[PDB]
Structures are given as C-alpha cells and as structure tokens.
Amino acid sequence: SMLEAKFEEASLFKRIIDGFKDCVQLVNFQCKEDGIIAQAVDDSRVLLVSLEIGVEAFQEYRCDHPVTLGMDLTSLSKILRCGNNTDTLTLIADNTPDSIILLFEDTKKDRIAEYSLKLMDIDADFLKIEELQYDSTLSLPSSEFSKIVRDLSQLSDSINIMITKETIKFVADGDIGSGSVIIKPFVDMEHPETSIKLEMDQPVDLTFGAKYLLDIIKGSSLSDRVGIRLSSEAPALFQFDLKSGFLQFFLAPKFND
Amino acid sequence: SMLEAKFEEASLFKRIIDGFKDCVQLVNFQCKEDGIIAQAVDDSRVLLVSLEIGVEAFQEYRCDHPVTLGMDLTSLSKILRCGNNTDTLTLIADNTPDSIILLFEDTKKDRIAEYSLKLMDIDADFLKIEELQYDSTLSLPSSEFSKIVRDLSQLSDSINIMITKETIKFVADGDIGSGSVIIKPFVDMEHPETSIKLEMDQPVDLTFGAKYLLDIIKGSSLSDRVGIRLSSEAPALFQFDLKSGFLQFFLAPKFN
Amino acid sequence: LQLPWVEKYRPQVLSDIVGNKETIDRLQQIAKDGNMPHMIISGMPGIGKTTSVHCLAHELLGRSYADGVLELNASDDRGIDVVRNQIKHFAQKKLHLPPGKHKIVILDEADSMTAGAQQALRRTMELYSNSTRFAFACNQSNKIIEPLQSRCAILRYSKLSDEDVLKRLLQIIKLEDVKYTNDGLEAIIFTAEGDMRQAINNLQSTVAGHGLVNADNVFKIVDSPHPLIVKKMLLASNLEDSIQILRTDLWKKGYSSIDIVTTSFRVTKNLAQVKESVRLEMIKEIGLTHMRILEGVGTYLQLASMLAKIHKLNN
Amino acid sequence: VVREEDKLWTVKYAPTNLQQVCGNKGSVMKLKNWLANWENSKKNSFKHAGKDGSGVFRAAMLYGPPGIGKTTAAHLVAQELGYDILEQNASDVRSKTLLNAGVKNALDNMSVVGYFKHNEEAQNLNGKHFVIIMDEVDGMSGGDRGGVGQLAQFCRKTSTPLILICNERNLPKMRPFDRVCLDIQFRRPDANSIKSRLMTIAIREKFKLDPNVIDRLIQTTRGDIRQVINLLSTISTTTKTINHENINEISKAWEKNIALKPFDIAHKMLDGQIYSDIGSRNFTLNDKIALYFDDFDFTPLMIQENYLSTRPSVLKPGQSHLEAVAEAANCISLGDIVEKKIRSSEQLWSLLPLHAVLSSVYPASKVAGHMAGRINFTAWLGQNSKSAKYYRLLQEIHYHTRLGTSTDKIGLRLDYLPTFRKRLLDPFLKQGADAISSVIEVMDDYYLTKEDWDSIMEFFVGPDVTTAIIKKIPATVKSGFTRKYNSMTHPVAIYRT
Amino acid sequence: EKRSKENLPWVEKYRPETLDEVYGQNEVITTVRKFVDEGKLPHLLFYGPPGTGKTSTIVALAREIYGKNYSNMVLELNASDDRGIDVVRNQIKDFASTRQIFSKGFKLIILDEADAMTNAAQNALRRVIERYTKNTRFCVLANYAHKLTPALLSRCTRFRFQPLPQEAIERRIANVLVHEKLKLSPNAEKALIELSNGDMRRVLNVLQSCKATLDNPDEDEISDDVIYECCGAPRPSDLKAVLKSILEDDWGTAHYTLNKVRSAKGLALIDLIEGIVKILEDYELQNEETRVHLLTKLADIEYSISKGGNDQIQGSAVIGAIKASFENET
DNA sequence: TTTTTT
DNA sequence: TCCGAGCGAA
DNA sequence: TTTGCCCGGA
C-alpha cells in the first residue's frame, strides 16, 4: 500500500498513545518519508500535544507521498486494545484514504486480525509552534516532577513556576495553606540521570492549571527525564524524549488577573 | 522566628500525629520553653487526647514566648504526607501567627520544601488533668492489649474490664455470645519487656465502647508497652510512653 | 483590547454609586465604623448590588482583602458539601484584623443555592459571627429561606431613577469627551429602563456607531423596549390599530412569535389599570395562542386572531 | 479579647438566664420541668407520668417559627440544670451511618469534658451527663439519608436526655417523631413581652425609640425577635430616632415576605377580599401567581379539593353559586390539559405561569368568599394510589386467567368478574362447606390462587360489595377452604412473574 | 469540504466571507467594524429571525480580527455541543482565564444558538463574563430572547438583525445571477422576494431549484411560472379567482371552483389560506366584526390543518367561514 | 421538575 | 412477621 | 388543618 509502517510489537504504539490519550480527543497524523508527526488540541483549547515518531521506531517503514489521517482517540484506543501486545502491528493506508488499517499479525501462527477505522475530515494546520529563544530551559528526572506536581495539586488548582538565577521554585497557595518546593541545579557524574539542568537568560514567573499538569505528567512513563521550556510570552513546552522521537505538551499559562 | 523546633527526622512527628489522628479532628498545641503539650477532645466528647513532647525529642528547640496553635488533623496529615521521612523537619512560627510553617530539608540533595498551614479558632480552654488517686494501675505489652481488644471487638460493641486481686478480666457480651480473656501478673526474666504488672488497691469494674478502644490501640506503634489506670467511676487512663514524652488517652466509661 | 466602559467605569468606592441613597449612606457608615452585619442585598439587574458588596469589602479590609474575603458565585460549586467544609473552615480560621473588622463571605447570586445548602449555613453564621460576617446578593429575595433572612439585615435596592442614571452618564461623558444632545441622553435613559449596565452599553454603542449622541443616532441602533410596544398594542381602542402595531412594530422587525406572546402575557399580568377579571380572560386567550405556537403553528395569523379575541373581550 | 462594640447586637443582648427570655414562659417552664425530673422518671423506666404527663418521654421536641428563642431556651435549660451539652445541627452530616458511628455512642456514656470540668466540685450529679441537642431537624436534606428515622429510634432508645428542634412541626417528614417526643410549642411573642428589652437596648445604644411604634415593628418582622434586633441595629447606624415620622417606610422596607404552606395557600387564594377592586389593587395578580409558585405541586390539587367548599362573595349579578362552580370546573379541566403538556417529553416549563392561572387563580376568583368549613387535604393523591394498587391487582388476575378467557383486562373487570363472583362466592352462601370442591375446580380451571380470590372479591362496588358478606361466613368454612386448597397442587400460569 | 465549492448547496456556497459581503444590516455592520477598528469590542448579542446573517457576521468578525487562522483562536460552541453547568465551569472558564496557544491576543468566545442553554448554565456564565472581561469577550446569538435570562441580557450589547429588506435581497440575487450565468424576469424576482419573507436561505434554495428546473439554463429564463412550478405554490390569479368565487357565487359554484383550481396544479389548502389572508388584510371593511370572525375562524382552520384532518371538510370550512364573516358587512 | 420582580 | 420511605406512577 | 400503598431492612 501507499503507507506501510510496521511496529515490531504493538505495545510501543499503545504506550505512546496512552501517553497523551487523556488530554485530547481528536488527533491528526501526518505521515511522510521521514516518519509520522501528530498534533491534537484539548477541548478547552488550552493544551496542545505534538508527537514525533521517526523511522527508527519502526521495523519497516514506507510512505510514498505525504498523507493526513484524522481520527478519534477513543476509537483508536478501543481498537488497539482488541490486539495483543506481542503481535506485530502494521499501519496501512492508501492514497486519499477513507480509513486507516491496523493489522495485527503474529508469526507463530497464521492468524491475521485486520481492523479498519474510518477517518475524519479534520482540516487543521499544525503551525510548528515552537518559539526560537525560550527564556528558561531546564531538565530534570520525570519521577521528581511527577512527585512535585502531585503533592502541590492537593493544595491548589493552580501551580506557579518561578525560574531565577540557579533556582527553580514551584508554588501552590490554597484554602488549607500553601506549599513551596525549591530545587537547585546539580551535576552528579555517578548518576547523570538524576541531574537537574538549568539555563536561563530572563527570569520567569508563570501560573498553570493543576489538572493540565496532572495530565501532562502521565508522559513520565515514556521517558526518564522531562525538559521544560518557559518564556514570558509563549506557551510552556514540556518535552519527553523517546528512543526515536518525542512527545511535547504546549500548555498556555493563566492570565495574570 | 519566635518558635523554631527541629526534628532531625520528620518521621517522628509523623508517627506521633498518626497515633491519634483517627480519633479527633481539631488539636490545640501549646509551645513553651520546656516543650510542647497538645490537647484534643473528640466530637462525641467521650475521649480526650493529651500529648507531651519534651525538648529531648528535638535536635534544636527555641520558643521565646508561649504560643497556642490550633490545627485540623486532616490538613496537617496531608501536608506531612507531602514530606520525606528522612528529611529534617522544622516547625516555625512568628508572633501571633495566622499560620504554622513546616519546613522539610534534605541537605544531601539540597532540596527544600516549605509548607504553610492555616491555623484555626478553637474556643476551648485546656482541661485540668492533674493526676488522680487511681484505684488500680497495671501495665502490659502493647501487642497483647491490641490483640485482646481486636479479638473482643467482634463479639460485642462494648468491652468490660474487671481488676481484682492478681487478676485482670476482659469481657465482651453481645450478638456473638460472651467472650472472656483472663490474665495474671507474671514476671519473665528471659523477656522482661513482655511482663504483665499489676497493682490494685480496691476492686475495679468499668465498661467502655469498642470503637473508642479500637482507636486507642492505634497508639501501639509508638510504644512497646501500655499503662492503664482505673478508678471506681472515672475516666480510664491509657498511657503510651515515648522516648522523651507520652501520649495519653482519657476514656469516659459507660454508666452503671 | 481596551476595557468596555461598563467595566472601565465600575465604581471602586461607595461614594461613586448612584441611587438607593439612604442604603448607600448606611453602607458608608458601616465601612467607616466596622461591625458589618450579615446582610442580604436584593433587586433588579444592573443596579449596583455586586458593586456595593465589593466596595464595602474593599474599604473594610484594606490590604487584608486577599486573605479575609471568600467570594463564591454561580460559577462556583456551592453544594451542601462546600457549605459544610470550605465555608465552615474559612469561618473557623485564624486571622488577626484591626478592631471592628471581620472576615467576609460573599455569596453572589445566592438565589440559585439549594434550600439544603442554605440550611447548612445557619449555625455557621451564628457560631462564628465574632470573626466572620456574610453578605448575600440576589435578584429574587423570596428564594432565600426565612431562617437565613432572620439572621440578616434586609437591604432591598430599588430601580435607578432617570436622574441617577443621568448623573452617572454625565460623569462618564465628561470623562470620555462625548458630544451629545439632551434628547440623545433622554433616549438612552428611555431605552435603558433603569438598568445602568444597559445605559452605559448603549452609550458606548451609539458613540462607536455615529459619534454624536442625539435621539436619531440612538434609535438607529437601539430599539425602543418591546414590552412598551406590546403594551401599546394591548391598549389600542380598535382592532385595526392594534393589528397595525403588531404588523409594523413587532412582526416586521423580526421579533419571534413566541417572544411576542410571552411578552403579551407578562404585560397583561401587570396592567394595573384594567380590572383583574378582564386580565384573567385576556390571559386565557393569550395562553391558548401560546400553546398553539409551542405546537409549531407560530404564524402571524395566530397572533392576529389573539388580538381579535382580546378585542372581543374588551368590548 | 473581643470588644463589645464588635459584636452583633443579637449576641451582646442574648439572654443569659431563663428569666431574660421573652414570651413563651409556659413553654420554657414545661421544658424545665421535663428536664429537672428526667432522672426520677428514668428510675421508673419512664412508665409513670405526673400531673403534666411528662414522665413517659425520654426526648423533647421544641417547635415554632424563626428567631423566637428555641435554641436559646434549650441551651439555657441544659446549663441551668448543670448538664454537659453535645450539639449537632444542619452543618453536620447526620445520616444514618454517621449517626450510628458518632453520637450513638454518647447516648449511654459519661462525658470526659463534664468529668474534668466539675471534678473538684463536690456533689455535682448532672455535670458528668449529656443533654444531646439536635438542632434544625427540618434542615436534614439528602445529605442525611435515613437520619430522621434513626433520630426517632434514638428518641425511643436513649439513656440520656435528648432535645430536638424544628421550625415546621406539621411537615410530613416529621411524622415519625409523633408518639415518641414531648412536644413543646413556641409561639410568636407579643410586643408587650419584649417592649422592656427593646427599650433597654435603645437606652444602652443611645438612640430614641418611641414605644408606640414598637407594635408595628413587631408586626413588620412577624414576631421574629432576632430580626427586630437586627432591624434596630441596622437602622440606628444613620437614623437615631425611630418614631411615627419614619415607621411607615421602615416597615415597608423590612417587611417579612414569607412563603405560605399548602393549607394557608388554599385559604388565602379562596379569600374574597383579595379579588375586590381595593383588594386586587393591594394584593396583585402577580402576588396570586406567586402564591401558586410557593408550592406548585399541591396548590392546584388544594384548589381543586376545596373550591366547592365556600360561600362566595364575588358572585356576579344573577349568577348562582352552581353556575360559578361550573365555570371554575371548566377552567380546572383546561388547566389539567396544560399540566399534561408541561410534564411531557417537551418539558414546556414556560407554560408554568399559564397553569398557575388556569388551575388555581381563575377558578378561585370565580368562587372566592368565606370557607364553609375547614380546608381539606386533597383526596386525589390517596385515591390515585388506591386506583394504582387495584390496576396492578387486575393485571395480575388478568394474566393468570389469560389462557382461558378472551378479553382485555377492562373487559375482565366489566363483564367477567360479576359471573366469577357467582361461581366463586355465592355457592359458599347457599351451601356452606359443600361448595369448597366446586369453587376449587373453577379456580383450577382459571389458574387462580387464594390471593386472586381475595383480590377479585375486593373489586365490586355498590350493592355488590363483599366485605360484610365474607365477614359473615363461618370460620369453619373459611378454614376448610384454605386447608383443602393448601392440601393439593394447583396449576401455574406464569412462574416467577 | 470535498472537491470544489461548486459541489456545495447555494446556501453554503454563497456564505459571506468578509463583512463587506453581509447585506441589509448596515447599521450593525458599521458599528461592529468600528468597534474592531478602535479596539473597543464589548460583549455582543445578535438577535434575529432565521437566515438574516448572524452566524455569518460573527464568523466574518472573527476572521477580520484574527486573520485566516481565527479557527484556532476562538472558542465556538453551539446547540450541537453539550453546554451544561459543568462545561461552563470547566471548558469555558478555562478558555476565558488562559492565554492563547497560537498567537498572543485577547480571547473570543462565541455562544451560537444560546437560547438552547439551560437557566443554570446561563447563571453560571454571569460572573465568568464579568470577571474575565479584560482579556475575553463573549458573543451570544439567538432567535428567541425569552429563553435568555434577564441577567445575561443585561451584560450584552444588543443588536437586532432585521428581516432582509428588498434592496439587499435584490443585490444578492444580482451577484448570484452573474456568477451562475442565470436570467431572472422582473415578475419572477418580485415573486421570489415576496415568498422569501426576508430569509436569504429561502431565496437561495428556491433559486437553485429554479435553475435545476430549466431545460437549458443558458438560454431559458426563470419566469414566475417556473417559481410557482418548483415551489408548488398558487399563482396570484388562482388566489383571486377562488376568493372572487367565494365572495360572489353560490355554494355549488364556489365548491366547484375551489376544487377545480386546486386540482389544476395540485395546490395545498394551507397555501390558499395564507394567500387569501394576505389579500383580505388590505380590504377596507365597514364592520370590525367581519375582521374578528375572519381572523378567528381562519386561525382555527390553520391549526386544525396542522394536525392533518379531512382536506375536503377543511376546504368547505374555509368557504363557509369567509361567506359567514362577510354576511356581517351587510 | 420551577416563571418572574419594578 | 412487622414497618412505614417516598411518590403519585390509574 | 397532610392520603394510600407499602420500601428496604430488621
């Protein structure tokens, strides 16, 4: 077919999809010769998810010409569940397609399971939203960010991130009181994966809705480290690196009341 | 800061709070130069909780002038659960505070978490609990009391305690019939910690609710043993001894 | 964007609120001397209820506003659980304020709160009054249960008179350098019907549209209130003139048949100059037509027939 | 710590002892007598009642309108007799689960607070015992499922005094308390019972109150003492003299607009005064429709129940009472049609005002006058319940006999059942116990049970009513019938319906 | 979309793209355009009957304010979406209180067909609208004001869209004719305008049907005959013949004439009733009782027709109603 | 299951 | 076996 | 100034 992309095991694609399933409903995949990119926007238009999968994630990949596949994530996840984590999963599409084929095939037997999901006429640009020179760029292990978010979300519906010279501060103020976590950069040559990195030109102070961060931290299952890029005038970028590509969340900050 | 009290390991305060968190909702702490004394009374006004923590429990302790801090147990508990057990915990308060600061520090990783908890209006003065001339005083390992209470809880919603000469009887009579446990003072030199000690001046007989005792025995995790003091018709005292202080439960008995 | 004039010229101090003079004076007195009672402020839309409560709170609490005020409105969750936990805890919390000042709970649009939730407030109001005071604002005061009305000072706001609206409008007009004629401002007042919000909105609309605020420019964009047109229709002496009003001023302006019939009911209800039994007969006929329209037969012929039947009655 | 000039007037002038309470002196004395002798009455298992009859109640229920001194009285009596007080109210969760896990344990428990408060005091018998106050029982909504029944249980099974408080005693949900509580009514206090208090407040706060206007104030707030004190507090801020020159507008501004309850709604709606020229000018059409909206599930039913029970004062010239009643009945029928449309799948709530006019206001306007007797509760609800029961029974009988008959259920009632009566009942009358076998044979032919027999005999009306006929049948025949029936098997038409 | 815009229905192919293509609402267009120009956008309400240009105008405004990428910068909700209290408190409140993802600027929330929202949701909207005014503006659109709460109406600047007047419809028709290479006679244009009741959707749908009805649309001309054919509507001459027969002939002849005229082109009875009512409205009548009887009886007949019934009996009812009412004229 | 106020 | 919750549903 | 049937549970 025009597009043929084989995942060695369907579990890879299932985990990738589960990494952002809860935040958005409709997703637009563009497949090109260099791989598959995808974008989605949440119902309130406050959060945007951007996925990139390179050809190295695939055992075999072929995309003769660019193609766009719009689909609902609930139907896709329902179908992905009908297949086994061990089977080989081939995504197949034809030119000007009305559906996407998910082909679950196991080499042990001669059992083929072919699903066809009807596609939507979702006409929307991606805009490649990424500001060039972000004010502050930091990176830290995913488990620690998850813990900070989970602790502070019990206190308030909003979480403030303040970046200043050599210090990252998370703050939440609520009905029963307030909490404040301060971390500092540190390089540990024995365990680089625990490192906390901070580069910054302009200090930053931005407020975010807690429920959105609670959704965003679900990407921690796909990467041990999370990168955070912040600017005074731009959405905040939360990036989780995959073995081949990436999962990005662009979250708009609250208006300064 | 007027009040700065530092536990080397936050786990201590955490276990103390977990001792009596499930039986009261509001607690009044009084901090003075000599340490901290807390009082709480349950909603039903059947049970009273008294806590003393001395200076020896603190890596460092300063409190310029006495202060009272009224706190809700649920909020403090969640805040504490947002803290590392191995971290250093500092309770900080300023003059005429509206909030109390709990400051967790891990100097190994250079990680500081500061939480602020809003104080409460408690319009209830401290009750005088001067030591009374108890008729009977006994002491036994906490585990035995916990097991006895748990076993007698299912038989009936109430438990009767009778102290007689060299005899301690627990009874539960209810839907599942009558269940009794009889113990005597025995001293075992091999394991002194498991000794049962008794001292009776007059025979004693009281009755208590099962749920109150189930809440009380949750304090076993703080002390290996528990001491019990009883009087003809008065609140029963259940004391767990901490390293530098104690946790006491005063339980009002049934009538008749 | 720039602020709409309604928000740009929202009063920040009690002395900028027009109308309801005696009540506003009492509120200024309270703000100066503290000891704020529990209070219920009620009245028609856009007459200064939310403005008054917020101004009073700001003046009372100064910089302690952020920690000393709990505001909840219809956009918030206000079920029995919230009343029993969040509001109760806020009432119980420590907060040192200067003598004569208290924490304030503002319950805006309180008439949408359930009866059970209101019941849950009674003893919290009573027990913690030495540190917390409650301000309710509503449009329909009869929706606040009597036990809560008992604990509150009753402040019923009246609609704004033409003079109050004129004074506030002149203030804004001088601040904004607006050119106007007396007929223009009278047209604004006429179409506002005592709602200051609408007066300012229509002033902005006229200025944006045509620059100069005279009667003709006002009526180019602002409609005369259709309840008054409907009243004219109902009071006409002969059937042909009433039908002419229906045809020209309502049906051919685009007003829906359901809007016309519901307004006819509401206006007939309040026609104090027509004896009540006649209004009951008219209401019966109007309701017949209303039911037909709801079945989907909302044509001009049905409304004309309604008018003919009303004419038969009032004859 | 708290200054006196920072307190609400209702707090700084709260009664501190039972003497300072205004009005309802007999009710307060009733409560005090009940609580003072509670231990003596307990010593007799609450089986002996004295002159007042209060010795057989472990619980007392106080009731009355808002702001008259109920909570004040309960707390003050408990303190005067030296009890410790445990209080819960509508801000607490009082569900069956919470009640059973919480306050239940205190019904027969000493108070630790009471013990330690009066430990030094010698011979303080009441200090260690509880008075449990359950305030605002009428406020227990869906957040307190099972609460009222559990509270009634406690009122029967408590070993310590319990006082309940409510505003609306006559509500249906308050029925369970009927036989287990000592009912103490609090009424609106009169102006004389509070004149001295109000004037003392005027002296203390330094504003001029003319006593002659106090009555009007009392009328303004409907005897709500809390509200009158609130009114004085608020008005005196800028107006330092309340007299005949300002009382009118103060009374207008602060008037109590309280919704009425169903019997009251029916009474006011059918009063002829409000439909006259002057009355209509004073009590407007909008106000009458608002009466409908006070309780929009009972008002149409109440009007339809009572609109025949008046002597009308609004009759037009030459119009007899019957003609007016016929006009009202026609309008009520039209209102029913509108009501059907409102609650259909369309959900046409915008017709609610129209319904108010058609179902309540217009017919009442036709027959308004004086009541020729008491206002009666609607009979439609109970009759509808009974009809539903009998239609259920008819459906059951129909599908038992379905395999044998040829008819719908209505034809079963109108045509078949009268002949079944002659095959199933009359043979008993004419032959004693000899008809047992024949009756059983018919029942078997039609798959009928003994329950079906009872149901069938219940259906007949007029000269064919069966209750007295069957009551007369000798017990021998009935016992033999039941015994022979239970001695054999019987065919079944529908297993596990 | 699929293939070209030539595959679309004319009602959608001719949807205005910019404010200059909205016709017959000049005062509103001028006011709102200068609102945008000066940066003063208040909370808007567009109230009006079907097919007068409300949705077209608000979407054109969004396009002008935000450019071609408006669709990712506004929150548009309509009756096809759930808009309960939960949606107001979460989706709408979050969008109102948060910055734009794509391009910096103020937020626009469009509540199309707002008369479909419940009272509770509308009340929840009040303080959302007021609190976030600095950065967010709401536009509400409705056909029925009575389902909108007084509090919501107070907060919006109201603009009434009128039924489209004759000149605007004529200009739009001229544009359509040019683009479609269509010809339209003057009488046909008059008939079209008359039957559209100032609803542009009706004009465009009828015109598309008329073009489909021609044999050769290049040479054939749309005459009023074509309009009546495709609409299955009475000619004015038929209406006048029926009314004359009713007013001047005996019962047998009037019944015969009604039946024959109806049978000629299979005319519906309700259309004849509408046309005759329009004709009779212009009559000068001596007695008001004539007007009363005519209106009440004809409204009763229209209502009964709406539920079905016997067509022959209803036609005889119309004849009798008109004759009996004019008896009062003496 | 809840329309309106002046 | 006894009891009445909550709803009007014939 | 409040009916009739009769829940779920003991």
Ligand SMILES: Nc1ncnc2c1ncn2[C@@H]1O[C@H](COP(=O)(O)OP(=O)(O)OP(O)(O)=S)[C@@H](O)[C@H]1O
């Ligand atoms: N008495 C007033 N004096 C000056 N401006 C007023 C007055 N009343 C209303 N306004 C203006 O209209 C706007 C709205 O006033 P609000 O106090 O919010 O009305 P409201 O009575 O709370 O309306 P509802 O009940 O929420 S519909 C204010 O920001 C002012 O700009």
Ligand SMILES: Nc1ncnc2c1ncn2[C@@H]1O[C@H](COP(=O)(O)OP(=O)(O)OP(O)(O)=S)[C@@H](O)[C@H]1O
């Ligand atoms: N008989 C009274 N005598 C003196 N003050 C009274 C009296 N009744 C009410 N008050 C005053 O109003 C305040 C409240 O009285 P309460 O006893 O709480 O009334 P209540 O009957 O319980 O009203 P509800 O049922 O809670 S709305 C008192 O503290 C007094 O200041």
Ligand SMILES: Nc1ncnc2c1ncn2[C@@H]1O[C@H](COP(=O)(O)OP(=O)(O)OP(O)(O)=S)[C@@H](O)[C@H]1O
């Ligand atoms: N003023 C107008 N100018 C040009 N075309 C119009 C105009 N009004 C309606 N139309 C045409 O009719 C179609 C529908 O227009 P809309 O603006 O969507 O109507 P609407 O006012 O939103 O109707 P409702 O209220 O949703 S039934 C447009 O696509 C246009 O083709």
Ligand SMILES: [Mg+2]
């Ligand atoms: Mg407001």
Ligand SMILES: [Mg+2]
């Ligand atoms: Mg009370």
Ligand SMILES: [Mg+2]
């Ligand atoms: Mg539209």
